[PDB]
Amino acid sequence: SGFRKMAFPSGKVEGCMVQVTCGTTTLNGLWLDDVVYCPRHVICTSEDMLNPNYEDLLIRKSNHNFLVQAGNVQLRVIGHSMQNCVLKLKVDTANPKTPKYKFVRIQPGQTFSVLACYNGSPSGVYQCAMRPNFTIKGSFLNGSCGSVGFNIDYDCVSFCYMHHMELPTGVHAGTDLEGNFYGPFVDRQTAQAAGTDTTITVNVLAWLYAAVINGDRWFLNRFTTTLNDFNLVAMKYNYEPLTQDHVDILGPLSAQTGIAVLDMCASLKELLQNGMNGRTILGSALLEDEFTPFDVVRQCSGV
């Protein structure tokens, strides 16, 4: 009973978190095997970030300039290199707490858990969605860069995000663990803006199914619609177009509730045009779009 935004257990990731310092700049690194991954702008001074030439800046750095601390123990840097927007610092010691892991570039509309860290020390965990405009809405202060986002299946940790920067709208941007940014963002302190923040339509429907499973059903009506009809309404409110693949993905939720996807679409169409009328769904007064269909099935089945 109950439906909550719930992150993965962070124990496997806490053991990989270290501190990386270059001059006066300190952020977080990810220690897996004998490599520490961190944002490359650790090598920037405050004046460098206006228009940094990372190639030229990294040339005057040596291994001994990268201070890597795992708790109270200093690690010995024996190599360094740049891969896109991340630095890889080779250390002489493999992380004994390295879990089975992979690097994945997550798709927009998918979710992951963030372990927010400061000075190599975990601070807290929360869920984020990779929004269609390739930003996330998290909680990151100064020094939180290098905090990572991840998913867990069984016992393998899939790292998908590392935090780099914040945008004027208050949203956040970063890279995958290969150093490639999500979206068009670049790691310089220049005027950058996130595009239109479109809503993840399939996720809203999954969350409406979660509400029905949890006993909330005031928003169900006697109506149905079609994909083309609903998408005409989804366009005005900047919702993503719903596809048959989205319908099939919602199959498990439609089968458990007995509510056909297009019937649920008619409910969402009425919620978009008429509003909620001061009522709530799963304790929210707006439509939630950061729960994937997998998130709903996982939480409502207890995996």
Q: Annotated catalytic sites, by residue? A: 41, 145
Least distance from C-beta 288 to Cl ion, angstroms?
A: 8
Q: Give me the 91-120 binding string for a copy of itself, x by CB under 8 A, dash otherwise.
A: ------------------------xx-x--
* C-alpha triplet 39, 21, 19: angle, nearest 5°: 75
C-alpha to C-alpha distance for 271 and 230, rounded to whole angstroms: 12
Amino acid at 71: G
Exactly one of 4, 60, 64, 100 binds a copy of itself (CB under 8 A); which one? 4
Query: Residues 166 to 225: which contact a copy of itself by CB under 8 A?
Result: 166, 170-172, 214-215
Exactly one of 81, 226, 238, 284 binds a copy of itself (CB under 8 A); which one? 284
Q: Is the dihedral of CA 87, 180, 185, 207 positive or negative?
A: negative
Q: What is the total count of residues that contact a copy of itself (CB under 8 A)?
A: 47
Least distance from C-beta 255 to a copy of itself, angstroms?
A: 19
Exactly one of 31, 54, 66, 140 binds a copy of itself (CB under 8 A); which one? 140
Least distance from C-beta 79 to a copy of itself, angstroms?
A: 29
74 near a copy of itself (CB under 8 A): no
Exactly one of 72, 244, 274, 302 binds a copy of itself (CB under 8 A); which one? 302
* C-beta neighbour count of 206 within 10 angstroms: 26
Q: Give me the 270-299 binding string for Cl ion, x by CB under 5 A, dash otherwise.
A: --------------xxx-------------
Q: 221 touches which of Cl ion, a copy of itself, none (CB within 5 to 8 A by kind)? A: none
Indicate the residue among 110 and 299 with the shorter CB distance to a copy of itself.
299
Q: Nearest residue by C-beta to Cl ion?
A: 285
11 near a copy of itself (CB under 8 A): yes
Indicate the residue among 70 and 200 with the shorter CB distance to Cl ion.
200
* Residue whose token pair is 């800046």: 57
C-alpha to C-alpha distance for 192 and 181, rounded to whole angstroms: 13
22 pairs with which residues across the strands? Answer: 25
Q: Do the Cβ atoms of 2 and 13 come closer than 8 Å? A: no
Tell me which long-range contacts 248-254 makes (C-beta under 8 A, separation of at least 24).
249/202, 249/293, 250/202, 250/205, 250/206, 250/209, 250/293, 252/293, 252/297, 253/205, 253/206, 253/209, 253/210, 253/213, 253/293, 253/296, 253/297, 254/209
DSSP output for 234-272: HHHTTBPPP-HHHHHHTHHHHHHH---HHHHHHHHHHHH
Q: 8 touches which of Cl ion, a copy of itself, none (CB within 5 to 8 A by kind)? A: a copy of itself
Residue ranges binding a copy of itself (CB under 8 A) = 1-11, 14-15, 115-116, 118, 122-126, 137-144, 166, 170-172, 214-215, 275, 278, 280, 283-286, 299-303
- The residues that touch Cl ion, with contacts defined as CB under 5 A, are 284-286
